[PDB]
Amino acid sequence: DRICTGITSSNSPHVVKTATQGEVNVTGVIPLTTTPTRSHFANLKGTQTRGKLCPNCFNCTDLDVALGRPKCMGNIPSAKVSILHEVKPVTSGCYPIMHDRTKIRQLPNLLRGYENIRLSTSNVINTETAPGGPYKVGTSGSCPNVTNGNGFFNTMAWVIPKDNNKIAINPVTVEVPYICSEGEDQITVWGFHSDDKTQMERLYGDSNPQKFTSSANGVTTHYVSQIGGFPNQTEDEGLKQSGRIVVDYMVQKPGKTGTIVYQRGILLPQKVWCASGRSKVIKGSLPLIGEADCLHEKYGGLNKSKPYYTGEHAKAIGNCPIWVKTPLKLANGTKYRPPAKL
Amino acid sequence: DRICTGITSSNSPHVVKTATQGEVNVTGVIPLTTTPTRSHFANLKGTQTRGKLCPNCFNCTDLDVALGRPKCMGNIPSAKVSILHEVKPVTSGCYPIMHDRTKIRQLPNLLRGYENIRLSTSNVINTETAPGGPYKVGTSGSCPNVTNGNGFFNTMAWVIPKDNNKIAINPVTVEVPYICSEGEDQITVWGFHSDDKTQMERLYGDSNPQKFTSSANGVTTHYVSQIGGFPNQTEDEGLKQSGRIVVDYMVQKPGKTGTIVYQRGILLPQKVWCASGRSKVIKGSLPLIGEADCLHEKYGGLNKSKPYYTGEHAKAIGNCPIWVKTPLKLANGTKYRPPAK
Amino acid sequence: DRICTGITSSNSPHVVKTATQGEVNVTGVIPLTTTPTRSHFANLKGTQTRGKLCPNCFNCTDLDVALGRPKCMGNIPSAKVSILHEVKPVTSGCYPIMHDRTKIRQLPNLLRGYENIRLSTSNVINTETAPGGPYKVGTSGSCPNVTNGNGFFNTMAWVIPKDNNKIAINPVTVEVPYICSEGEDQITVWGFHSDDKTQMERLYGDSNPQKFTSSANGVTTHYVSQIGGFPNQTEDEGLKQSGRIVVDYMVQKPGKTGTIVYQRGILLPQKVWCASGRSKVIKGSLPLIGEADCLHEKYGGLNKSKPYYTGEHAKAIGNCPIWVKTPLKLANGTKYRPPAK
Amino acid sequence: GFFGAIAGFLEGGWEGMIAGWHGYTSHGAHGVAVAADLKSTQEAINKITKNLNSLSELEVKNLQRLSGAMNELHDEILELDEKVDDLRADTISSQIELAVLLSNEGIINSEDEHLLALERKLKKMLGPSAVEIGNGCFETKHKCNQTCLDRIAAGTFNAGDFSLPTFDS
Amino acid sequence: GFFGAIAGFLEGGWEGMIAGWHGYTSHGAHGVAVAADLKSTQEAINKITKNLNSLSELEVKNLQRLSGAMNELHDEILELDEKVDDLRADTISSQIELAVLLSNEGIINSEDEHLLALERKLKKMLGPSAVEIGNGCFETKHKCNQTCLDRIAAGTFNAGDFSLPTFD
Amino acid sequence: GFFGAIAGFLEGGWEGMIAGWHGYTSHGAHGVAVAADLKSTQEAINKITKNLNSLSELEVKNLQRLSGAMNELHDEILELDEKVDDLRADTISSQIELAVLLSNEGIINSEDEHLLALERKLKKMLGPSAVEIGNGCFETKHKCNQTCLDRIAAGTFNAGDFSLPTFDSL
């Protein structure tokens, strides 16, 4: 008899590409990819994941906390991974800010980029020795404190000239010292109050526009105040006010000082942020539901099965599948053969 | 007899590299690369390609159009591909600008980065209710309009205090509202006029330097005017003028307002640009002649043959060959063999 | 008899990965990686390597040279490779600067990014025709020149109003011309002096804060001076002074002018830096000891043996091994086999 | 593949070969018997399995947001960051596509090598009385129906079962 | 390659083999006849052609300008954008060179495998009376001149035409 | 490998084969003689050497600092530059790992192909009187001891030295 070597013949619906034979049908494949489906965001497995800056600060937005709004101070956990859930953060209390006249909205998003975030215990500037005659610190009904008394953003001091000091001044300069610990960035919050013509003179003895200038790390910023005719209060405490404040932040790298040149209405920095390390940040939404191998900006929380995935590529952190252009298959069978003429 | 398997022997001048045998000679190769030659730029096949912002604005530079120079208004076609043909765009008419004192030159290059570009039909600020007393709008012989009457950049209003209002002012603040449609960026053009001491007093009732400050998306810019002793007119209409203007632009993201703090001589924004989408931009030159698979910053328009190319790597868009360090060959023959003894 | 083909059997402690057989033991490997050890930095073999900007300016810091401190003028050799040894450059003489109020510290680091660095021989502005009345140029005991007479930073001119000109001025504007050669960047150094109320009145006839504004390539900067209550003198000559200066730089691309708007206390630019080409820059330390194939920010100078290395990846220039995640081996032997039964 | 095509190996296949990918056919008075070789099939499956593990070992860096670059304020920087992510995705994907291509290339091409190895298994069992044709076939002195072929595939076939000479182990 | 070198395959080649890359020679009283095998040559050419198509299928993203980054104003960003482009070009180029190298590696290496396959074609035609040497050669009982060799290359050779046995 | 495993090649190895990686064994009354084939071992070594040179030819661009981006002033840009360096390092590393993997795959896989080539060298020397088994072994009519086996490995073995027929050489 004649005994020969042979290869099977079976249903071969699967196709793979080869270098030397082009596309070929095969009896079986191992799929290397899946297309994920959109899910809720979640905690990253093996890593505590930051959402809100201060989780236990209820009825407080991240921007509220970052500005040091009264009643909005609390434990701020360190985190190696953070979720950016507000592309344009809003306030929900305290004195009315004209937010979009500065970069201030992104301040909490800047903070969450650090692993460790803490507020300083000391004031970075002494209101009692600050340039521009003698001051008293102002308070407001829009900012009730922890004993429910009238207060203000803990990051700032609303200084109002004493009765012997109700007069216009030349722009005076204050040096803002670095008071944070080794390796920490200092993020200094400051601004200026303004009002209509009548209130300006009562408070400051000057109803002309006031000018303000900051300098840090080669970056200079210049502002000129507005006297009356303000846009309406928004994202605030809800108590009617005739004035508005403008708020800004100033980043000071380790051992670096900043300066603020100012006139009337200045909000001097007090408590400053001290921050170190890096937190890994992606866009997501709240609340974080459950646990996942991987956080993905398009698909939210997902667990890893296949080594690769197809679909919408986006930023992702954790134990993630690697994005590929096409649904790759690994051949697990033989190239198609027509049945032999027996 | 003895019958054997054998391999041919032929002239083998071509060389390829292997992993396990180093370089070897072969009887034939398929070249995988070419070196392109510099050609004129062209239309990208299957894609409308933007050169000039406004094709129907004849005798108008892109910067002319972007500033709203009179006689230079028209349709700005959408385009997914745009050619940057001016690294430092120039004006060719209208009122003398001191260009290099701001970022204004790049304004049309900023615009072409968008797929869709249109000018607003309404004014973003009403000159008759604008802060700083009552105004009249100024015009100039340098800016003749479509009926050759005195005009001005349509993106701005040269506001001049009325005869009962010729007085210095403290800096006043105006909010520039977002007036564009969903998803569009608003690009606000504005500036300030200045002159010698005499004209300054006649026009504004103040011959001191005026100060101007803008704020948008966290970006603040501050300017101080110059009184007389100006640099010489360039890139303008050619009509002699004693004054100069400084012009700037302000990008406003969707739903975002900006502010301008100003004194005398202010050029208030009027018509603003509304822009959306992204256009793919590379450096090139005009005119676009014919059609091509690929536009390449060094070689201009080129059609694709070989899968790879050698030479000068640069930005390129379309159906392009992929750059490689060396002229790669695919072996199409056999390794060299000496003639059998 | 029976004759068979066979493979050796030996001690096989080395392991390599395969595609189709997983990890396998082998009789021998060729190691493709090493872990380098931290070493002193060195000159890049075959390439002049810049450390100090001015090698022949002894007891002069890079920032001293960049500001044109007296006695710190000299040849600045071109170099295609440069070492950044000061992340925050310091001065070591001359008049007390309040460094951190501007970006001025990084100026020598900016310069070293160019292949060619030279100081202009002519002044970019004539102090005798500069806006703001007639001037005399100030000098200081803090800045002794090469014959130990009182001087000042050669990049600037401390202009002081004449005894008949001690008066306040509105901010005046000066254009800073481009005076460099084809293709060169111009880096313009300028600033302003300030003092306590008493000296301000003596020197300038005004004790109010003075304001300064610069504009170049769309970049505007605004400063307001401080009257008295200065921080302590640091990084200077050590001679006690009541005043302080603030110094800034201004980059002017080829053919570009800049402007400076100023009042009293201005330090007008004089000699400017002209720079061209690119130098390859990495962080390192001085002195450069010996020669090396490769400069590595973590390991310093190292010579190349293996094609790859494992360890701390960082910026590196020259003939360097390529970083890999794991210690790769090339199989150089046979897959392990147990001794034949 | 190209080897079999040139060598005159049978280009068709056997539907009856269901227990494996590779094996033997027998042609005689019985008609045509077909048996799969499990050893050859297992080896092929194991190679593919190791190849799967190898492809699954790849680790690449996560792409996340810049900590310093703020929305609106740093949109130009953010556009470049977007481009960096996109090019990374593009480049690594094509690298993975190359790795998978070479894997499948190896897997498909190795078919004829299995047949060549199965020849060696067959030859030794058939003994010195069998004649090697060259096209993957052998001519036997004995009959080999399905019962015989099964013993071949299982490696239990002895030529002594027809009193024919064997190669001693 | 290494196989042929160890196996004792002829390391030289035949200038007369012009119609193909691979084939047969016959050595006898006629001298030396040479015939190219067209099937083997076609197979090699087709593999290379498919390999060309595979290499030509690679698509990578266009590199263009940033839409937002303006000349002069954003030169620092633009320098980094330039660096990103250069590194992309460098990396993909080196990836392509690797892909082409492995392709050429395959093509050159497959030569001896073609010779080994031609052995099987030759062996079956020559019949059981021919003797396999191992070095890619067979000793025949009959003469085979060029007219004969052409019939081998063409696959029409029959051993009965020399009254020799065939594989039935 | 898989070939030898299916073909029934000996899965063990010979400790006495010290002069080379590949070669021959002979089994008879003398016991078992072992000789390494130097040509086969050399060929493998040359391939590995060429593979080493090929891997060493790879050049990639240096990663250095941006010339324009200044510390502190341009920290946001500098963070992105760090990311670019990190991703370059990551990507090229995995590409190199793939290249080395494919190299080692080739080297390990080539073993059985060396054995198949050694069969052809052996077969021609043994002459037409020897019988090919298929598992890499040959049955000889004659004795072949260590002195004999060494002559096989050296390529000097003649079948006439046992009065057996030879393939006449061309």
Ligand SMILES: *[C@@H]1O[C@H](CO)[C@@H](O[C@@H]2O[C@H](CO)[C@@H](O[C@@H]3O[C@H](CO)[C@@H](O)[C@H](O)[C@@H]3O)[C@H](O)[C@H]2NC(C)=O)[C@H](O)[C@H]1NC(C)=O
């Ligand atoms: C929460 O806010 C309340 C204010 O609503 C803070 O209590 C108040 O603090 C001010 C300033 O220290 C007190 O005014 C002082 O009064 C004395 C005489 O009584 C006078 O000599 C001082 O010069 C100054 O004017 C005020 O009396 C005090 N209490 C109230 C009811 O207003 C409170 O400290 C805040 N708590 C926290 C935790 O911030």
Ligand SMILES: *[C@@H]1O[C@H](CO)[C@@H](O[C@@H]2O[C@H](CO)[C@@H](O)[C@H](O)[C@H]2NC(C)=O)[C@H](O)[C@H]1NC(C)=O
């Ligand atoms: C090879 O695989 C392709 C893809 O699965 C098969 O083509 C498909 O055949 C089905 C019939 O069941 C059709 O409904 C599809 O439209 C076909 N798709 C394409 C893209 O052609 C093909 O039949 C397979 N060939 C063999 C021999 O099995």
Ligand SMILES: *[C@@H]1O[C@H](CO)[C@@H](O[C@@H]2O[C@H](CO)[C@@H](O)[C@H](O)[C@H]2NC(C)=O)[C@H](O)[C@H]1NC(C)=O
């Ligand atoms: C990803 O896997 C985790 C488990 O590792 C899932 O969390 C589990 O969820 C089920 C209910 O759905 C619970 O009973 C388990 O106790 C959870 N385990 C842990 C460790 O939390 C998670 O739901 C998965 N997520 C996705 C999107 O698949």
Ligand SMILES: *[C@@H]1O[C@H](CO)[C@@H](O[C@@H]2O[C@H](CO)[C@@H](O)[C@H](O)[C@H]2NC(C)=O)[C@H](O)[C@H]1NC(C)=O
């Ligand atoms: C590759 O395909 C083979 C079959 O061709 C799979 O092996 C079989 O798996 C089934 C389970 O579904 C078992 O019942 C069989 O015993 C296995 N062996 C055979 C049929 O010979 C194998 O699992 C596939 N590979 C992977 C990674 O899934």
Ligand SMILES: *[C@@H]1O[C@H](CO)[C@@H](O[C@@H]2O[C@H](CO)[C@@H](O)[C@H](O)[C@H]2NC(C)=O)[C@H](O)[C@H]1NC(C)=O
């Ligand atoms: C293999 O190819 C190389 C490169 O084409 C040949 O070397 C060239 O030979 C020509 C003529 O002899 C010279 O003019 C060139 O200068 C040589 N090139 C180099 C780089 O030296 C070589 O001759 C070829 N070898 C064979 C056997 O054909």
Ligand SMILES: *[C@@H]1O[C@H](CO)[C@@H](O[C@@H]2O[C@H](CO)[C@@H](O)[C@H](O)[C@H]2NC(C)=O)[C@H](O)[C@H]1NC(C)=O
């Ligand atoms: C172009 O030129 C002048 C502007 O100087 C415009 O003329 C004005 O037209 C309105 C309405 O017809 C009259 O009420 C004014 O009195 C005219 N002013 C002058 C100075 O003549 C003319 O309308 C402009 N045309 C445009 C803008 O299309």
Ligand SMILES: *[C@@H]1O[C@H](CO)[C@@H](O[C@@H]2O[C@H](CO)[C@@H](O)[C@H](O)[C@H]2NC(C)=O)[C@H](O)[C@H]1NC(C)=O
């Ligand atoms: C431009 O041409 C003008 C006249 O159109 C030239 O006149 C200058 O004007 C200034 C005014 O302050 C005076 O110093 C002199 O009349 C001229 N100065 C110089 C240096 O020549 C002037 O030369 C040209 N360049 C300018 C104005 O920058």
Ligand SMILES: *[C@@H]1O[C@H](CO)[C@@H](O[C@@H]2O[C@H](CO)[C@@H](O)[C@H](O)[C@H]2NC(C)=O)[C@H](O)[C@H]1NC(C)=O
């Ligand atoms: C690229 O190819 C196009 C063809 O697709 C060329 O355009 C053609 O040019 C010929 C020459 O006169 C005309 O007859 C055709 O009508 C043109 N066709 C189209 C669609 O334009 C083009 O010139 C080529 N360009 C380059 C640089 O090679």
Ligand SMILES: *[C@@H]1O[C@H](CO)[C@@H](O[C@@H]2O[C@H](CO)[C@@H](O)[C@H](O)[C@H]2NC(C)=O)[C@H](O)[C@H]1NC(C)=O
């Ligand atoms: C690879 O080279 C071969 C020759 O070695 C080319 O084959 C030639 O192609 C022509 C038609 O183009 C046909 O007549 C024959 O197949 C060959 N001619 C001769 C005279 O031998 C083949 O085209 C090349 N492959 C590619 C893709 O270019």
Ligand SMILES: *[C@@H]1O[C@H](CO)[C@@H](O[C@@H]2O[C@H](CO)[C@@H](O)[C@H](O)[C@H]2NC(C)=O)[C@H](O)[C@H]1NC(C)=O
């Ligand atoms: C294959 O190589 C591995 C790695 O060198 C060997 O495993 C090591 O064996 C030594 C004994 O000398 C132990 O001290 C190590 O702890 C082992 N390490 C690991 C990771 O297993 C293994 O013995 C080798 N196998 C053979 C057959 O040689």
Ligand SMILES: *[C@@H]1O[C@H](CO)[C@@H](O[C@@H]2O[C@H](CO)[C@@H](O)[C@H](O)[C@H]2NC(C)=O)[C@H](O)[C@H]1NC(C)=O
């Ligand atoms: C270095 O030293 C002094 C700087 O004070 C310079 O000499 C001055 O020249 C003026 C000429 O107008 C004379 O009043 C004195 O000779 C010096 N001035 C004073 C106030 O004493 C000298 O030129 C400087 N430069 C050098 C030496 O290159």
Ligand SMILES: *[C@@H]1O[C@H](CO)[C@@H](O[C@@H]2O[C@H](CO)[C@@H](O)[C@H](O)[C@H]2NC(C)=O)[C@H](O)[C@H]1NC(C)=O
């Ligand atoms: C790398 O390059 C060379 C290696 O030869 C070294 O330069 C020599 O080092 C010796 C020993 O220290 C000294 O004689 C000189 O420094 C050099 N000699 C000559 C003749 O140039 C260099 O030190 C090596 N560096 C490292 C880190 O390996």
Ligand SMILES: *[C@@H]1O[C@H](CO)[C@@H](O[C@@H]2O[C@H](CO)[C@@H](O)[C@H](O)[C@H]2NC(C)=O)[C@H](O)[C@H]1NC(C)=O
């Ligand atoms: C790979 O290993 C082989 C042997 O395992 C090395 O070749 C032997 O090593 C040295 C040469 O320096 C001598 O002792 C032997 O004579 C060599 N030849 C043999 C054993 O046949 C070879 O050098 C290694 N490859 C590399 C690149 O180091």
Ligand SMILES: *[C@@H]1O[C@H](CO)[C@@H](O)[C@H](O)[C@H]1NC(C)=O
């Ligand atoms: C607030 O209301 C006033 C009139 O009551 C109007 O002028 C202004 O545009 C409003 N602004 C907002 C933000 O609602």
Ligand SMILES: *[C@@H]1O[C@H](CO)[C@@H](O)[C@H](O)[C@H]1NC(C)=O
């Ligand atoms: C417009 O073009 C004409 C000729 O085409 C030319 O004379 C003129 O200078 C150009 N510019 C203006 C402003 O007319």
Ligand SMILES: *[C@@H]1O[C@H](CO)[C@@H](O)[C@H](O)[C@H]1NC(C)=O
């Ligand atoms: C500043 O200098 C004075 C004068 O020597 C000295 O007494 C004081 O301690 C210094 N302070 C600081 C903070 O350096």
